[PDB]
Amino acid sequence: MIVLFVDFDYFYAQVEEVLNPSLKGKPVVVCVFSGAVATANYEARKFGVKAGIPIVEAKKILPNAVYLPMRKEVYQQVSSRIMNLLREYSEKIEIASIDEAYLDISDKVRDYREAYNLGLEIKNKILEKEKITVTVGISKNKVFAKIAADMAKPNGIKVIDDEEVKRLIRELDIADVPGIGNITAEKLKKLGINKLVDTLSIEFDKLKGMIGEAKAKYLISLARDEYNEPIRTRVRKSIGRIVTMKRNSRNLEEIKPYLFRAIEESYYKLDKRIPKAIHVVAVTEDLDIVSRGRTFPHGISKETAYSESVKLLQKILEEDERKIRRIGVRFSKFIT
């Protein structure tokens, strides 16, 4: 398998510059609504503005930058044309987000040298057609192709060959692995699980007890150099997990922890999808479902999800008399 990942560099800022040529050479800061920095262009970054910071903080660092509001509709139009460009290089495309796409090019190229040249041609094609630079990472699976891009960005191209995958499995710290945070890394550190390869020194049941089933399976398959997730776009109206309990119960306290395991797995699977709706799903002992949900004016943080989920499960415990056998959550109504 040869996977080619495409990361659009500072995408909203590049689009604003393509659309407004007189902004080129000036600091440009695209803002999410204060209000935070969505993206900072070359000059804005040079003078100390980073994505994610409050706009109030951005204006203290660089008072006279050009501060623009986000025009996501416009950025989406550009993005979709670029994804279209990319299908003509492979039909096995996974649109991961507005600025990120994976291509399986196993049938398009013979080796990593050929992969590289194709990455070069994709860069040239997008620059020619859309006036936008991209980073290309290439490796044996989606995860290492994404690590590749992160080693090369911006305006770069990097291959991680089979031998480099193996060195990286040994040398990468847990926090370096795409999708895995510091909280997760810190727990694992507490066990002397430091490197990606160290996840192979722990029993699976023990690993999943500390970090959850999904993260455990993910890290282990990567460390085993066995990760081979297909490249296709999916297509999620909902993201959720239902967990079978050891025993039928109506005890809110006995039930809570499985609900939380469900929420934790769901949130890992969300990625950076932001749900506006949540439903608690209870599978009763007779194998029916009772469910209760809420749709918030605001995206649901993982905290808001814990709180709310207990409230919804409490409602279920009140308006239904059966014992609960399995329990889970569903998140839906994703912005945008």
From Swiss-Prot:
One biological process term in Gene Ontology: error-prone translesion synthesis
Cell compartment(s), UniProt: Cytoplasm
InterPro entries: DNA/RNA_pol_sf, DNA_pol_Y-fam_lit_finger_sf, DNA_pol_Y-fam_little_finger, DNA_polymerase-Y, DNApol_IV, PolY_HhH_motif, Rev_trsase/Diguanyl_cyclase, UmuC
Thermal properties: Highly active from 35 to 95 degrees Celsius. Thermostable.
Catalytic activity: DNA(n) + a 2'-deoxyribonucleoside 5'-triphosphate = DNA(n+1) + diphosphate
Sequence positions that bind Mg(2+): D7, D99
A GO term for molecular function: DNA-directed DNA polymerase activity
Main location: cytoplasm
Role: Poorly processive, error-prone DNA polymerase involved in untargeted mutagenesis. Copies undamaged DNA at stalled replication forks, which arise in vivo from mismatched or misaligned primer ends. These misaligned primers can be extended by PolIV. Exhibits no 3'-5' exonuclease (proofreading) activity. It is involved in translesional synthesis.
Protein name: DNA polymerase IV
Lineage, uppermost ranks: Archaea, Thermoproteota, Thermoprotei, Sulfolobales, Sulfolobaceae
Gene it is expressed from: dbh
